[PDB]
């Protein structure tokens with residue numbers, strides 16, 4: 022469900038120069054049929070509107086936000102002769118692509134309407150018809166958008182398509198005038214295409230962008246170029262490499278997961294992995310000996326337990342019938358693999374039913390709204406444990422819920438222990454392999470020596486535990502360590518309330534206090550404590566001096582989502598994103614009691630030198646740094662290392678290695694080691710880098726240039742953060758006019774002043790990562806505090822779509838946004854509107870007082 | 877090269893292909909024609 | 918018609934000549950041989966990026982065998 026998610030990558034001079042020949046090639050089974058089935062199935066089940074509309078809106082908005090340093094502004098102004106190549110009609114009845122009219126109407130924030138658009142394409146209706154890849158007579162456009170299919174011309178393969186892409190790039194190259202820009206669509210990103218792009222186009226632009234809106238699990242891509250026919254030395258960079266890595270990885274994972282659901286509009290009979298199980302009894306009898314349905318319901322329960330099971334009681338064809346429905350999943354049927362006898366159920370809940378219930382119609386994917394945050398958080402949590410357990414491992418789980426999710430997650434040959442307080446409900450006498458339960462506290466004492474165990478867990482538990490006992494996170498952690506000290510375990514998994522970056526707040530979901538080390542969950546209504554990374558680390562170092570500690574990353578993985586799709590738990594993009602953000606402060610600690618230690622030496626902040634010393638090795642051994650399943654670098658090749666800075670030294674006196682680095686992305690990197698002339702891989706601890714502070718201060722002078730040049734002000738910002746501005750209209754973020762404020766360089770921002778700016782607040786927001794406003798959301802309260810002149814001419818525009826009527830010293834003159842408004846003879850309109858929405862013009866009011874009242 | 881789910885072509889980079897340059901198969905297409913105009917009348 | 922037809926292929930012929938000449942596709946006496954994966958892996962390593970074979974493979978191969 023939900024809207025689409027956009028990804029982009031921009032060119033930066035500062036990165037390592039990657040070549041065309043080492044970007045990830047596309048998969049080779051990409052055309053083999055079952056994958057095609059998966060792509061079909063995912064696309065059919067997508068709650069969304071006109072795809073061509075939403076993609077084009079995304080790309081146009083992100084295209085009106087690319088600046089030329091040489092002239093301090095967008096390559097995308099207004100009035101630009103714009104060619105839409107590939108104008109598919111669209112059988113919706115508009116006969117045209119469904120964004121042109123909203124575009125020119127200026128019904129998009131951040132996208133000034135153009136002069137005109139010319140629609141060329143095979144299936145155009147309101148334009149002209151031609152096959153573009155070959156020459157055709159036309160005039161010159163300033164911006165050329167492309168949405169051309171390449172799975173049509175050229176027969177069914179990939180090299181002919183590769184040639185089509187070059188043809189299209191050259192044709193667009195010719196259509197644009199010097200200094201213009203163009204966007205092209207790519208069906209299949211293959212290596213030789215970027216080879217061609219690098220040796221044929223890159224030296225003929227000024228900047229370039231890559232963009233990927235994600236609406237269906239595919240490999241579609243958009244490539245954007247600026248400043249055509251101007252020479253530079255642009256080549257692919259590090260960010261391109263990383264982006265392509267993720268843009269293939271995500272696809273591969275989602276395709277695997279999607280390839281398991283039953284076909285769209287299928288016939289469930291029990292063999293399918295996911296099905297709507299259901300059984301009914303005609304004229305039910307409960308009170309006396311049944312032995313007929315007492316097994317009947319129990320079989321279904323064992324089939325699909327722990328998943329929501331719904332009932333109806335009604336009458337059909339004269340017979341009083343009871344119907345049971347539910348759903349089966351790999352985990353639900355994995356639980357069945359662990360029983361030996363069949364557990365049975367008390368039916369007392371049911372014979373008491375004296376009411377009447379209508380039946381219903383089976384729907385596999387039941388949810389209509391999108392999955393809630395915390396359920397998804399729990400799923401993304403449990404994927405880690407379900408992956409991190411192999412067969413036969415002797416398991417001790419703490420915080421075990423009464424419903425015992427674990428009995429549905431691990432293999433059916435691993436003994437488990439439930440360590441919790443409330444009595445469970447799971448049966449006792451049907452378990453093929455060992456399974457124990459307990460009624461006591463896992464923060465308590467004097468119960469540990471008697472319990473076997475290899476992997477010890479605690480998930481979404483300890484923060485509430487510490488809060489309940491009025492206990493701090495530090496003390497709670499140390500007491501848990503103490504309890505595990507005299508145990509016999511081997512590896513520990515613990516969810517930990519502790520940040521991973523600059524402390525921020527997630528709106529309405531998790532609000533964080535930096536006075537007392539406390540989180541708050543508003544939807545849950547509770548105040549809990551936390552602690553800090555370095556504080557916790559020493560405690561783990563104490564009881565285990567052989568402790569290798571890692572902080573497993575999640576806010577790029579999607580494999581965890583397989584714990585949803587396979588029991589029909591509908592997903593929303595927003596519910597995903599908030600789950601990553603919430604996870605950046607509720608991470609998971611993976612502690613090995615006898616791994617190889619790693620000590621953190623320097624200051625771990627982006628833009629700062631870091632240092633690590635890794636003991637206990639030999640000079641003939643390697644290390645590899647990964648980041649989002651990429652490869653930052655390896656020691657064997659120090660030079661072609663994708664990170665900004667590498668160092669490598671060895672202490673033949675002590676056998677201690679030394680790596681002294683600089684990074685460029687906040688988050689988690691992982692270092693892994695390679696020992697010997699063998700393919701064997703060891704897993705050393707990972708580490709976290711964090712972004713520089715989010716703090717902002719700004720200077721506002723005393724003289725205000727109410728003229729066109731406009732006042733210029735100082736905004737002190739650490740340069741790593743890139744900045745823009747926004748407005749909140751109707752609860753929705755709108756892009757501020759690039760013609761209104763101009764950043765440039767210290768840092769100085771330009772602004773044209775207006776009365777309208779008094780009645781709208783303005784925010785400086787940050788777009789460097791995938792998300793926006795997560796680190797810096799700084800309102801400009803100073804802007805809503807301006808002191809107008811009266812002896813001075815003024816810019817002026819309407820605030821919004823409401824109905825503001827002007828007053829000169831409390832005397833209405835006209836009415837903005839009114840039917841049958843008439844312009845004053847002393848007012849005057851301005852060439853390019855300063856408004857936040859391009860439709861609303863901007864006028865020139867002659868000197869005086871101007872007051873607007875809402876109505 | 878295979879642009880389709882089912883392949884019934886000739887896998888150029890597939891196996892089973894044969895490269896045996898032989899004297900008997902000395903390549904040629906159309907070097908010259910007896911376009912002499914006396915013989916063309 | 919013949920002359921103008923032969924005009925168009927003025928480059929494609931050159932590319933095919935490059936393909937057949939970069940390594941010996943003819944011998945004076947007897948017969949020689951070499952695995953196809955190797956020789957194909959070579960061609961994708963020496964033909965210029967602009968060569969039409971890089972974008973039109975199968976027809977080039979069948980023409981070669983013709």
Ligand SMILES: *C(=O)CCCCCCCCCCCCC
Pocket residue numbers: 049179180877878888889957960961962964970971974
């Ligand atoms: C099949 O998987 C499509 C990609 C591979 C096609 C073969 C390589 C492209 C060029 C043809 C032969 C290589 C030497 C020119």
